Amino acid sequence: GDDRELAILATAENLLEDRPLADISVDDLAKGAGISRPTFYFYFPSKEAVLLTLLDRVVNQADMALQTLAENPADTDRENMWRTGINVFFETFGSHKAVTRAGQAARATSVEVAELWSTFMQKWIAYTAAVIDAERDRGAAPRTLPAHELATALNLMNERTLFASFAGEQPSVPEARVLDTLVHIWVTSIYGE
Amino acid sequence: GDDRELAILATAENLLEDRPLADISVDDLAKGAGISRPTFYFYFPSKEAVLLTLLDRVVNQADMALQTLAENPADTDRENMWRTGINVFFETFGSHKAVTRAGQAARATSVEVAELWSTFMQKWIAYTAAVIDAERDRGAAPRTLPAHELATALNLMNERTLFASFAGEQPSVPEARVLDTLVHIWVTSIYGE
């Protein structure tokens, strides 16, 4: 039963690797999931609710991985610690590029997708700023910009640069180089005087 | 004659301050410009070509201002020089927020808008990297990341952070704080070891 729902989600993710949400119909979803069209509408109100759920699962996966990291300090220098935290996003979203791309194009039209993204971005920026503040309180980072404004720009940078790399946009940082590039900007801007 | 065209462009920019492209019709454009609907179609193929031209004029205005800056060095420290160059974009796009917002939402659907944006971004990143390279050649900046990858991420950061500030997205850096925030990230990441 939760089976049919997972089948629908797995079909949508497979089809989104090939074409946009606009080019996928409810029948394609139903057909791929081994069900009828009215049976589909029982699990989801629309193909957009299917995308909404896929992005929800992707965002919550990253957010949980991040909480795991937070409760379990990695034992390394400062630079590697930022790298590990950014890496959560590089791997989680980079393992679901079709959902990332469609979820981002849907922010322009779907109020729920825009709100879901915006809640989590606020959470990840607040956490980033709490860490920068701890680093300043401990004397490891200088008091330059307002931690929260600095955290806002760096998280926006990552959203745009990661997602450009994953879609292979022109211009974009090659995906093999994007982690190194962002970590350098984060560590210089956070610790640089 | 070029009069009617300017009237149509000025009407579209005024209406875009109130509602999205989808909520504006060719008749609204024609009516505001003091012309008929078939007369409209003589100057522009569609309301989307009107947006395309508006964004074209905005992008070329910034690019020309930047060329002016380039040919006329401002006589100040390094930090102020980056601030002046970023400021070109903060003021040019920030003086046309409705076009910026609609032009960005149209990149998801219009191949010409996507290509126009992508050409200019490549140009501005190449110029940014040429400057970072000159600074490294002169011994003023360390050889850290590949200048071109560093320039890519910083320009993407600015596109996303400026445009979030202008739309008042949640989250965003307040528009009174966005210039300072980006300049700090640019100067630390470019000059920081």
Coordinates of C-alpha atoms in Angstrom, one line a residue:
Chain A
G1 CA 0.0 0.0 0.0
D2 CA 2.9 2.2 1.0
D3 CA 4.3 0.0 -1.8
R4 CA 2.2 1.6 -4.5
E5 CA 3.2 5.1 -3.2
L6 CA 6.9 4.2 -3.4
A7 CA 6.4 2.8 -6.9
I8 CA 4.8 6.0 -8.0
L9 CA 7.7 8.1 -6.4
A10 CA 10.3 5.8 -8.0
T11 CA 8.6 6.1 -11.4
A12 CA 8.5 9.9 -11.2
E13 CA 12.2 10.0 -10.2
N14 CA 13.1 7.7 -13.2
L15 CA 11.0 9.7 -15.7
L16 CA 12.4 13.0 -14.4
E17 CA 15.9 11.8 -15.5
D18 CA 14.6 11.8 -19.1
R19 CA 12.2 14.8 -19.3
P20 CA 10.6 17.7 -17.4
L21 CA 7.5 17.6 -15.1
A22 CA 5.5 19.2 -18.0
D23 CA 6.4 16.3 -20.3
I24 CA 5.3 13.7 -17.8
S25 CA 1.6 12.8 -17.4
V26 CA -0.4 11.2 -14.5
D27 CA -0.9 8.2 -16.9
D28 CA 2.9 7.8 -17.3
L29 CA 3.2 7.7 -13.5
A30 CA 0.3 5.3 -13.0
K31 CA 1.5 3.0 -15.9
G32 CA 5.1 2.9 -14.5
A33 CA 3.7 2.1 -11.0
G34 CA 1.5 -0.8 -12.2
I35 CA -1.8 1.0 -11.3
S36 CA -4.7 2.9 -13.0
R37 CA -5.1 6.6 -13.2
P38 CA -7.9 6.9 -10.6
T39 CA -5.9 4.7 -8.3
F40 CA -3.0 7.2 -8.6
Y41 CA -5.3 10.0 -7.5
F42 CA -5.9 8.2 -4.4
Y43 CA -2.2 8.4 -3.3
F44 CA -1.5 11.8 -4.7
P45 CA -3.6 14.8 -5.7
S46 CA -1.4 15.6 -8.8
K47 CA 1.9 15.0 -10.5
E48 CA 3.1 18.2 -8.7
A49 CA 2.4 16.6 -5.3
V50 CA 4.5 13.8 -6.4
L51 CA 7.5 16.2 -7.1
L52 CA 6.7 17.9 -3.8
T53 CA 7.0 14.6 -1.9
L54 CA 10.2 13.6 -3.8
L55 CA 11.9 17.0 -2.9
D56 CA 10.6 16.7 0.7
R57 CA 12.3 13.3 1.0
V58 CA 15.5 14.7 -0.5
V59 CA 15.6 17.7 1.8
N60 CA 14.9 15.7 4.9
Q61 CA 17.6 13.2 4.0
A62 CA 20.2 16.0 3.8
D63 CA 18.8 17.6 7.0
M64 CA 19.0 14.3 8.9
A65 CA 22.5 13.5 7.6
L66 CA 23.5 17.0 8.8
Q67 CA 22.0 16.4 12.3
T68 CA 24.0 13.1 12.4
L69 CA 27.1 15.0 11.6
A70 CA 26.3 17.7 14.2
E71 CA 25.8 15.2 17.0
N72 CA 29.0 13.4 16.0
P73 CA 31.9 15.7 15.5
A74 CA 34.4 14.5 12.8
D75 CA 38.0 14.6 14.2
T76 CA 39.9 16.7 11.8
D77 CA 41.1 20.4 11.2
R78 CA 38.6 23.2 10.7
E79 CA 38.9 23.1 6.9
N80 CA 37.9 19.4 6.8
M81 CA 35.0 20.0 9.1
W82 CA 33.4 22.5 6.7
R83 CA 34.2 20.2 3.8
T84 CA 32.3 17.4 5.5
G85 CA 29.3 19.5 6.1
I86 CA 29.1 20.9 2.6
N87 CA 29.7 17.3 1.4
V88 CA 26.3 16.3 2.9
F89 CA 24.6 18.5 0.4
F90 CA 27.0 17.7 -2.5
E91 CA 26.3 13.9 -2.0
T92 CA 22.6 14.1 -1.1
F93 CA 21.4 16.4 -3.8
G94 CA 24.1 15.1 -6.3
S95 CA 22.6 11.6 -5.8
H96 CA 19.2 13.0 -6.8
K97 CA 20.0 15.3 -9.6
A98 CA 16.7 14.9 -11.5
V99 CA 14.6 15.7 -8.4
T100 CA 17.0 18.6 -7.6
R101 CA 16.6 20.1 -11.1
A102 CA 12.8 19.7 -11.2
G103 CA 12.3 20.9 -7.6
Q104 CA 14.3 24.0 -8.4
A105 CA 12.4 24.7 -11.5
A106 CA 9.1 24.3 -9.6
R107 CA 10.0 27.0 -7.0
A108 CA 8.9 29.5 -9.7
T109 CA 5.4 28.1 -9.7
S110 CA 4.6 26.1 -6.7
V111 CA 4.0 27.9 -3.4
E112 CA 4.5 24.7 -1.4
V113 CA 7.8 23.9 -3.0
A114 CA 9.0 27.5 -2.4
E115 CA 7.9 27.3 1.2
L116 CA 9.5 23.9 1.8
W117 CA 12.8 25.2 0.3
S118 CA 12.6 28.4 2.2
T119 CA 12.0 26.6 5.6
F120 CA 15.0 24.4 5.3
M121 CA 17.3 27.1 3.9
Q122 CA 16.4 29.2 7.0
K123 CA 17.3 26.3 9.2
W124 CA 20.6 25.6 7.5
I125 CA 21.6 29.2 7.5
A126 CA 20.7 29.5 11.3
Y127 CA 22.8 26.5 12.0
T128 CA 25.7 27.8 9.9
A129 CA 25.6 31.2 11.7
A130 CA 25.5 29.4 15.2
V131 CA 28.7 27.6 14.1
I132 CA 30.4 30.8 12.9
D133 CA 29.3 32.4 16.3
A134 CA 30.8 29.5 18.3
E135 CA 34.0 29.8 16.3
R136 CA 34.1 33.5 17.0
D137 CA 33.3 33.0 20.8
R138 CA 36.1 30.5 21.0
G139 CA 38.5 32.9 19.4
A140 CA 39.1 30.8 16.2
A141 CA 37.4 33.2 13.7
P142 CA 37.5 37.1 13.6
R143 CA 34.4 39.2 14.2
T144 CA 34.0 40.5 10.6
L145 CA 30.5 40.5 9.0
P146 CA 27.3 39.7 11.0
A147 CA 27.4 35.9 11.2
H148 CA 23.9 35.5 9.9
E149 CA 24.4 37.7 6.8
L150 CA 27.7 35.9 6.1
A151 CA 25.9 32.5 6.5
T152 CA 23.0 33.6 4.2
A153 CA 25.3 34.5 1.3
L154 CA 27.4 31.4 1.6
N155 CA 24.4 29.1 1.7
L156 CA 22.9 30.8 -1.3
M157 CA 26.3 30.5 -3.1
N158 CA 26.2 26.7 -2.4
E159 CA 22.6 26.3 -3.6
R160 CA 23.3 28.1 -6.9
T161 CA 26.8 26.6 -7.5
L162 CA 25.9 23.0 -6.5
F163 CA 22.8 23.0 -8.6
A164 CA 24.5 24.7 -11.6
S165 CA 27.2 22.0 -11.4
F166 CA 24.7 19.2 -11.2
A167 CA 22.7 20.4 -14.2
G168 CA 25.9 21.0 -16.1
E169 CA 24.8 24.7 -16.8
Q170 CA 27.0 27.0 -18.8
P171 CA 28.7 28.5 -16.7
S172 CA 29.2 26.1 -13.8
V173 CA 32.1 24.7 -11.8
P174 CA 32.8 21.1 -13.0
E175 CA 31.3 18.7 -10.5
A176 CA 34.7 17.1 -9.6
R177 CA 35.9 20.6 -8.6
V178 CA 32.8 22.1 -6.9
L179 CA 33.4 20.8 -3.4
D180 CA 37.0 22.2 -3.2
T181 CA 35.9 25.5 -4.7
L182 CA 33.1 26.1 -2.1
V183 CA 35.2 24.9 0.8
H184 CA 37.9 27.5 0.0
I185 CA 35.4 30.3 -0.2
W186 CA 33.8 29.2 3.1
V187 CA 37.1 28.9 5.0
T188 CA 38.6 32.1 3.7
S189 CA 35.5 34.1 4.3
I190 CA 34.8 32.7 7.7
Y191 CA 38.4 32.8 9.1
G192 CA 39.9 35.6 6.9
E193 CA 40.5 39.0 8.6
Chain B
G1 CA 8.2 54.7 -34.5
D2 CA 11.1 53.7 -32.2
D3 CA 8.7 55.7 -30.0
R4 CA 6.0 53.0 -30.1
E5 CA 8.6 50.3 -29.3
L6 CA 9.8 52.3 -26.2
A7 CA 6.2 52.8 -25.1
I8 CA 5.6 49.1 -25.2
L9 CA 8.9 48.4 -23.3
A10 CA 8.1 51.1 -20.7
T11 CA 4.5 49.7 -20.3
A12 CA 5.8 46.1 -19.8
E13 CA 8.3 47.3 -17.2
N14 CA 5.5 49.2 -15.3
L15 CA 3.1 46.3 -15.4
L16 CA 5.8 43.8 -14.3
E17 CA 6.2 45.8 -11.0
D18 CA 2.5 44.7 -10.3
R19 CA 2.2 41.2 -11.6
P20 CA 4.0 38.3 -13.4
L21 CA 4.4 37.9 -17.2
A22 CA 1.6 35.2 -17.2
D23 CA -0.8 37.8 -15.7
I24 CA 0.0 40.4 -18.4
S25 CA -1.7 40.1 -21.9
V26 CA -0.6 41.5 -25.2
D27 CA -3.7 43.8 -25.0
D28 CA -2.5 45.3 -21.7
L29 CA 0.8 46.1 -23.4
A30 CA -0.9 47.5 -26.5
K31 CA -3.4 49.5 -24.4
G32 CA -0.6 51.0 -22.2
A33 CA 1.4 51.9 -25.3
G34 CA -1.5 53.7 -27.0
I35 CA -1.7 51.2 -29.9
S36 CA -3.8 48.2 -31.2
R37 CA -3.1 44.6 -30.7
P38 CA -2.1 43.9 -34.4
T39 CA 0.1 47.0 -34.3
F40 CA 1.9 45.5 -31.2
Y41 CA 2.7 42.3 -33.3
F42 CA 4.4 44.4 -35.7
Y43 CA 7.1 45.6 -33.1
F44 CA 7.3 42.3 -31.2
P45 CA 6.4 38.7 -31.9
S46 CA 5.0 38.1 -28.4
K47 CA 5.0 39.4 -24.8
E48 CA 8.0 37.1 -24.1
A49 CA 10.0 38.9 -26.8
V50 CA 9.2 42.1 -24.9
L51 CA 10.7 40.6 -21.7
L52 CA 13.6 39.3 -23.7
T53 CA 14.3 42.8 -25.0
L54 CA 13.9 44.4 -21.6
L55 CA 16.5 42.0 -20.1
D56 CA 18.8 42.5 -23.0
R57 CA 18.8 46.2 -22.4
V58 CA 19.4 45.7 -18.6
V59 CA 22.3 43.2 -19.2
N60 CA 23.9 45.5 -21.8
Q61 CA 23.6 48.5 -19.5
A62 CA 25.5 46.6 -16.8
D63 CA 28.0 45.3 -19.2
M64 CA 28.7 48.8 -20.7
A65 CA 29.0 50.3 -17.2
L66 CA 31.5 47.6 -16.4
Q67 CA 33.5 48.3 -19.6
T68 CA 33.6 52.0 -18.5
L69 CA 34.9 51.1 -15.2
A70 CA 37.5 48.7 -16.7
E71 CA 38.9 51.5 -19.1
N72 CA 38.9 54.0 -16.2
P73 CA 40.6 52.5 -13.1
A74 CA 39.0 54.0 -9.8
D75 CA 41.9 55.2 -7.6
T76 CA 41.4 53.4 -4.3
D77 CA 42.5 50.3 -2.4
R78 CA 41.9 46.7 -3.6
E79 CA 38.8 46.3 -1.5
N80 CA 37.1 49.4 -2.9
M81 CA 37.9 48.4 -6.4
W82 CA 36.0 45.1 -6.0
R83 CA 33.2 47.0 -4.3
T84 CA 32.9 49.4 -7.3
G85 CA 32.7 46.5 -9.7
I86 CA 30.1 44.6 -7.8
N87 CA 28.2 47.9 -7.3
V88 CA 27.7 48.1 -11.1
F89 CA 25.4 45.0 -10.8
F90 CA 23.8 46.0 -7.5
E91 CA 22.8 49.4 -9.0
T92 CA 21.9 48.3 -12.5
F93 CA 19.8 45.3 -11.7
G94 CA 18.6 46.9 -8.4
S95 CA 17.2 49.8 -10.6
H96 CA 15.2 47.3 -12.6
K97 CA 14.0 44.8 -10.1
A98 CA 10.8 43.8 -11.9
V99 CA 12.7 43.0 -15.1
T100 CA 15.4 41.1 -13.0
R101 CA 12.8 39.0 -11.3
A102 CA 10.7 38.2 -14.5
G103 CA 13.9 37.6 -16.5
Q104 CA 15.1 35.1 -14.0
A105 CA 11.8 33.3 -13.8
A106 CA 11.8 33.1 -17.6
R107 CA 15.2 31.3 -17.7
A108 CA 13.3 28.2 -16.7
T109 CA 11.2 28.3 -19.9
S110 CA 12.8 30.5 -22.5
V111 CA 15.8 29.2 -24.4
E112 CA 16.7 32.7 -25.6
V113 CA 16.6 34.2 -22.1
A114 CA 18.7 31.3 -20.8
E115 CA 21.3 31.8 -23.7
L116 CA 21.4 35.6 -23.2
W117 CA 22.1 35.2 -19.5
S118 CA 24.6 32.4 -20.1
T119 CA 26.6 34.5 -22.6
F120 CA 27.0 37.4 -20.4
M121 CA 27.7 35.3 -17.3
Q122 CA 30.6 33.7 -19.2
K123 CA 31.9 37.1 -20.2
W124 CA 31.7 38.5 -16.6
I125 CA 33.4 35.4 -15.2
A126 CA 36.2 35.5 -17.8
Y127 CA 36.8 39.1 -17.0
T128 CA 36.7 38.3 -13.2
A129 CA 39.2 35.5 -13.7
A130 CA 41.5 37.8 -15.9
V131 CA 41.6 40.2 -13.0
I132 CA 42.3 37.6 -10.3
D133 CA 45.2 36.3 -12.7
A134 CA 46.6 39.8 -13.0
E135 CA 46.5 40.2 -9.3
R136 CA 48.3 36.9 -8.8
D137 CA 50.9 37.7 -11.6
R138 CA 51.6 41.0 -9.8
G139 CA 52.1 39.2 -6.5
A140 CA 49.1 40.8 -4.8
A141 CA 47.0 37.6 -4.4
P142 CA 48.1 34.0 -3.6
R143 CA 47.8 31.1 -6.2
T144 CA 45.0 29.1 -4.4
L145 CA 42.1 27.8 -6.5
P146 CA 42.1 27.9 -10.4
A147 CA 41.1 31.6 -11.0
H148 CA 38.4 30.6 -13.4
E149 CA 36.6 28.2 -11.0
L150 CA 36.9 30.7 -8.1
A151 CA 35.5 33.4 -10.5
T152 CA 32.6 31.1 -11.5
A153 CA 31.5 30.5 -7.9
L154 CA 31.7 34.1 -6.8
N155 CA 29.7 35.3 -9.8
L156 CA 27.0 32.7 -9.2
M157 CA 27.0 33.7 -5.5
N158 CA 26.4 37.3 -6.6
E159 CA 23.6 36.4 -9.1
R160 CA 21.7 34.4 -6.5
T161 CA 22.3 36.7 -3.4
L162 CA 21.6 40.0 -5.3
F163 CA 18.5 38.6 -6.9
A164 CA 17.2 37.1 -3.6
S165 CA 17.8 40.5 -1.9
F166 CA 16.0 42.4 -4.7
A167 CA 12.9 40.1 -4.5
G168 CA 13.0 40.2 -0.7
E169 CA 13.1 36.3 -0.7
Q170 CA 13.1 34.5 2.6
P171 CA 16.1 33.9 3.2
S172 CA 18.0 36.9 1.7
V173 CA 20.6 39.4 2.9
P174 CA 18.8 42.8 3.4
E175 CA 19.4 44.9 0.4
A176 CA 21.2 47.6 2.5
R177 CA 23.7 44.9 3.6
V178 CA 24.2 42.9 0.5
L179 CA 27.0 44.9 -1.1
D180 CA 29.2 44.8 2.1
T181 CA 28.5 41.1 2.5
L182 CA 29.6 40.1 -1.1
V183 CA 32.6 42.4 -1.1
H184 CA 33.9 40.7 2.1
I185 CA 33.5 37.2 0.6
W186 CA 35.2 38.3 -2.7
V187 CA 38.2 40.0 -1.0
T188 CA 38.7 37.2 1.5
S189 CA 38.4 34.5 -1.0
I190 CA 40.6 36.2 -3.6
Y191 CA 43.4 37.5 -1.3
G192 CA 43.1 34.9 1.6
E193 CA 45.9 32.2 1.8

